[PDB]
Motif scaffolding. Sequence first.
Motif, PDB file in Angstrom:
ATOM      1  N   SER A 112      32.357  27.204 -43.195  1.00 15.02           N
ATOM      2  CA  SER A 112      31.167  27.080 -44.031  1.00 15.02           C
ATOM      3  C   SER A 112      29.986  27.746 -43.312  1.00 15.02           C
ATOM      4  CB  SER A 112      30.877  25.603 -44.324  1.00 15.02           C
ATOM      5  OG  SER A 112      29.568  25.404 -44.828  1.00 15.02           O
ATOM      6  N   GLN A 113      29.153  28.479 -44.044  1.00 14.53           N
ATOM      7  CA  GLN A 113      28.006  29.139 -43.425  1.00 14.53           C
ATOM      8  C   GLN A 113      26.773  29.067 -44.325  1.00 14.53           C
ATOM      9  OE1 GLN A 113      28.659  33.261 -42.408  1.00 14.53           O
ATOM     10  NE2 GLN A 113      26.964  33.329 -40.935  1.00 14.53           N
ATOM     11  N   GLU A 114      26.231  27.863 -44.479  1.00 10.05           N
ATOM     12  CA  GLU A 114      25.079  27.645 -45.348  1.00 10.05           C
ATOM     13  C   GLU A 114      23.740  27.925 -44.670  1.00 10.05           C
ATOM     14  OE1 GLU A 114      25.453  27.003 -48.486  1.00 10.05           O
ATOM     15  OE2 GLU A 114      27.476  26.177 -48.673  1.00 10.05           O
ATOM     16  N   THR A 115      23.739  28.012 -43.341  1.00 13.57           N
ATOM     17  CA  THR A 115      22.516  28.286 -42.586  1.00 13.57           C
ATOM     18  C   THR A 115      22.749  29.423 -41.600  1.00 13.57           C
ATOM     19  OG1 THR A 115      22.851  26.838 -40.653  1.00 13.57           O
ATOM     20  CG2 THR A 115      22.060  25.800 -42.691  1.00 13.57           C
ATOM     21  N   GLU A 116      21.683  29.878 -40.948  1.00 15.84           N
ATOM     22  CA  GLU A 116      21.784  30.978 -39.988  1.00 15.84           C
ATOM     23  C   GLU A 116      22.065  30.507 -38.560  1.00 15.84           C
ATOM     24  OE1 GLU A 116      18.146  33.237 -40.468  1.00 15.84           O
ATOM     25  OE2 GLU A 116      18.946  34.292 -42.217  1.00 15.84           O
ATOM     26  N   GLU A 117      21.657  29.282 -38.230  1.00 20.15           N
ATOM     27  CA  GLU A 117      21.827  28.761 -36.865  1.00 20.15           C
ATOM     28  C   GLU A 117      21.984  27.244 -36.872  1.00 20.15           C
ATOM     29  OE1 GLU A 117      18.648  30.022 -34.259  1.00 20.15           O
ATOM     30  OE2 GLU A 117      19.067  32.153 -34.586  1.00 20.15           O
ATOM     31  N   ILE A 118      23.110  26.751 -36.361  1.00 18.08           N
ATOM     32  CA  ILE A 118      23.347  25.314 -36.206  1.00 18.08           C
ATOM     33  C   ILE A 118      22.842  24.791 -34.863  1.00 18.08           C
ATOM     34  CG2 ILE A 118      25.095  23.535 -35.986  1.00 18.08           C
ATOM     35  CD1 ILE A 118      26.797  25.340 -37.944  1.00 18.08           C
ATOM     36  N   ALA A 137      19.691  22.514 -38.735  1.00 20.50           N
ATOM     37  CA  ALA A 137      19.649  23.966 -38.544  1.00 20.50           C
ATOM     38  C   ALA A 137      18.262  24.509 -38.214  1.00 20.50           C
ATOM     39  CB  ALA A 137      20.193  24.662 -39.793  1.00 20.50           C
ATOM     40  N   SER A 138      18.209  25.793 -37.856  1.00 16.59           N
ATOM     41  CA  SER A 138      16.958  26.426 -37.440  1.00 16.59           C
ATOM     42  C   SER A 138      15.950  26.571 -38.579  1.00 16.59           C
ATOM     43  CB  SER A 138      17.236  27.803 -36.822  1.00 16.59           C
ATOM     44  OG  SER A 138      17.818  28.692 -37.764  1.00 16.59           O
ATOM     45  N   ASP A 139      16.429  26.532 -39.823  1.00 21.77           N
ATOM     46  CA  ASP A 139      15.528  26.580 -40.982  1.00 21.77           C
ATOM     47  C   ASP A 139      15.004  25.197 -41.370  1.00 21.77           C
ATOM     48  OD1 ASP A 139      17.802  25.445 -42.121  1.00 21.77           O
ATOM     49  OD2 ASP A 139      18.018  26.951 -43.694  1.00 21.77           O
ATOM     50  N   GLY A 140      15.336  24.190 -40.565  1.00 27.03           N
ATOM     51  CA  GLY A 140      14.841  22.850 -40.803  1.00 27.03           C
ATOM     52  C   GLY A 140      15.761  22.032 -41.677  1.00 27.03           C
ATOM     53  N   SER A 141      16.792  22.669 -42.224  1.00 23.22           N
ATOM     54  CA  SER A 141      17.659  21.960 -43.163  1.00 23.22           C
ATOM     55  C   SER A 141      18.643  21.039 -42.447  1.00 23.22           C
ATOM     56  CB  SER A 141      18.411  22.948 -44.077  1.00 23.22           C
ATOM     57  OG  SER A 141      19.438  23.641 -43.400  1.00 23.22           O
ATOM     58  N   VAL A 142      19.058  20.005 -43.168  1.00 19.69           N
ATOM     59  CA  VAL A 142      20.015  19.041 -42.678  1.00 19.69           C
ATOM     60  C   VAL A 142      21.104  18.925 -43.725  1.00 19.69           C
ATOM     61  CG1 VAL A 142      20.406  16.631 -42.084  1.00 19.69           C
ATOM     62  CG2 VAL A 142      18.334  17.819 -41.283  1.00 19.69           C
ATOM     63  N   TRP A 143      22.346  19.144 -43.299  1.00 21.88           N
ATOM     64  CA  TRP A 143      23.506  19.120 -44.184  1.00 21.88           C
ATOM     65  C   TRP A 143      24.448  17.996 -43.794  1.00 21.88           C
ATOM     66  CZ3 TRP A 143      24.390  23.084 -48.007  1.00 21.88           C
ATOM     67  CH2 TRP A 143      23.366  24.036 -48.055  1.00 21.88           C
ATOM     68  N   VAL A 144      24.984  17.299 -44.790  1.00 25.51           N
ATOM     69  CA  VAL A 144      26.012  16.303 -44.555  1.00 25.51           C
ATOM     70  C   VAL A 144      27.271  16.713 -45.309  1.00 25.51           C
ATOM     71  CG1 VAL A 144      26.647  13.877 -44.722  1.00 25.51           C
ATOM     72  CG2 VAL A 144      24.251  14.505 -44.286  1.00 25.51           C
ATOM     73  N   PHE A 145      28.380  16.846 -44.585  1.00 29.73           N
ATOM     74  CA  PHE A 145      29.644  17.282 -45.169  1.00 29.73           C
ATOM     75  C   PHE A 145      30.686  16.208 -45.008  1.00 29.73           C
ATOM     76  CE2 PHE A 145      27.590  21.141 -43.558  1.00 29.73           C
ATOM     77  CZ  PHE A 145      27.581  21.958 -44.688  1.00 29.73           C
ATOM     78  N   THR A 146      31.604  16.122 -45.970  1.00 32.16           N
ATOM     79  CA  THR A 146      32.770  15.277 -45.782  1.00 32.16           C
ATOM     80  C   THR A 146      34.026  16.143 -45.835  1.00 32.16           C
ATOM     81  OG1 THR A 146      31.754  13.223 -46.518  1.00 32.16           O
ATOM     82  CG2 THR A 146      34.121  13.392 -46.731  1.00 32.16           C
ATOM     83  N   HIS A 161      12.192  19.211 -43.465  1.00 36.89           N
ATOM     84  CA  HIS A 161      11.553  19.818 -42.291  1.00 36.89           C
ATOM     85  C   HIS A 161      11.139  21.248 -42.623  1.00 36.89           C
ATOM     86  CE1 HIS A 161      12.771  16.470 -39.777  1.00 36.89           C
ATOM     87  NE2 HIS A 161      14.054  16.774 -39.846  1.00 36.89           N
ATOM     88  N   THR A 162      10.033  21.708 -42.044  1.00 35.36           N
ATOM     89  CA  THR A 162       9.542  23.071 -42.289  1.00 35.36           C
ATOM     90  C   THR A 162       9.671  23.972 -41.062  1.00 35.36           C
ATOM     91  OG1 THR A 162       7.198  22.788 -41.639  1.00 35.36           O
ATOM     92  CG2 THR A 162       7.826  22.068 -43.850  1.00 35.36           C
ATOM     93  N   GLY A 163      10.177  23.415 -39.968  1.00 39.95           N
ATOM     94  CA  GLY A 163      10.504  24.181 -38.780  1.00 39.95           C
ATOM     95  C   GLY A 163      11.871  23.730 -38.295  1.00 39.95           C
ATOM     96  N   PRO A 164      12.384  24.353 -37.223  1.00 42.51           N
ATOM     97  CA  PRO A 164      13.718  24.026 -36.703  1.00 42.51           C
ATOM     98  C   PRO A 164      13.968  22.525 -36.581  1.00 42.51           C
ATOM     99  CG  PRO A 164      12.815  25.872 -35.500  1.00 42.51           C
ATOM    100  CD  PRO A 164      11.734  25.422 -36.443  1.00 42.51           C
TER     101      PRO A 164
END
Length: 406
Positions: A112-118, A137-146, A161-164
Amino acid sequence: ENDSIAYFDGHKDSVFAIAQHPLYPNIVATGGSEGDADDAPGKGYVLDISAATSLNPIFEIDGHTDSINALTFTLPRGDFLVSGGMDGRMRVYAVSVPQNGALAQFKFLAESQETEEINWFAPCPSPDHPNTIALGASDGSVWVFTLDANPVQIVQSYFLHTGPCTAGAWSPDGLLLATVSEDESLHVYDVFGVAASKSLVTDNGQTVVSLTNVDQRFAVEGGLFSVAVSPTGAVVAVGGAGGQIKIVGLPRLQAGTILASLQIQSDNIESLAFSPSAPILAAGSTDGSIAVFDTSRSFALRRHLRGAHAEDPVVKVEFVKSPPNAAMAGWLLTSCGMDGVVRRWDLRGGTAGPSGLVKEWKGHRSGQEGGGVLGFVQGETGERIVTVGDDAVVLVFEAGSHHHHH
């Protein structure tokens, strides 16, 4: 000089990440960078530490086009091994550990590659939701996967989040996920919808706590870098620039208020840990110190361990879950630092109201010599410690509680 009982030198450069199988402490995965060229790939390995002097991998993790930055075995039983890179790739491997044959098998399942940097992984501790993992991730996003059964379900994808996004921690019941950011915000996500059903979510519908830079009593100028949730789930601690720590209340599943603010240390709080059974919180700083606070006494200072890792960054602190001496439960803390040393501390001492150095393990180079300890695992008992270094080496240390008397 060198206290290690085994080593692995296969990584070509910085070993950034390490994960340990939750049932089989001898099974450890390590991951990092293969060099400093702009195009240098990432590489991971799985090791069997029961062979412990030079270790041979039982599996190789390929496919990352940039450094591996995060690794985790899933809870509760390590059904999956997941690698996360500075390329944003999340690679999922099925794990099989036969009590019969010569054990561990690993099979690539999905990427899976939803962001640029984990930046980090955290497995969900809820027994209700096995094989669930979070990342930031570096874009501030938070992902939860099962990881189930399109073997990768997306449970949540948050963009608050608006920063890393620098760190994340689950509540012990696995229902809340607290994450922090360089942009100074804290969000605590209602990952499985339980708080929403109890009318305990904020206006954004997603979190039970949301605090940002506009909240003057919360704002830590320079950003947040660490986060930890207490064993009862009642509070979250965030650590950031300038040695600052904030304690924030959580709802039990009161919420969102600042219960204590701390600033005893002088530089970034890079690591925070609540003791699993003693009423203390430990904080490791870029300035080389560890500070210990009494959680049942308004976070009064118990001890300021200046120079715990000389003047080099304290990278990680972590309590031993089940020390061989059961009476020391909750009081033993392992730390590692950019001085190249791993240490263990007895935290019973200090001002408790109404050094403590127990052991040192040397073998990595110091940061000044191109090393530094970037991480470790220590199993349930703390008796075997596996480290990852910026000097591209993995070391194995032992505490030696069993003297094997005759």
